């Protein structure tokens, strides 16, 4: 997870 939260999101994903 790049947000410290505990869920990756899709354009988050794409950085995870
Ligand atoms: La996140």
Redesign the pocket.
Do not use: L, N
């Given at each position: 997870?790049?947000?410290?939260?505990?869920?990756?999101?899709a354009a988050?994903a794409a950085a995870?």
């Open positions: 997870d790049k947000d410290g939260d505990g869920y990756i999101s988050e995870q």
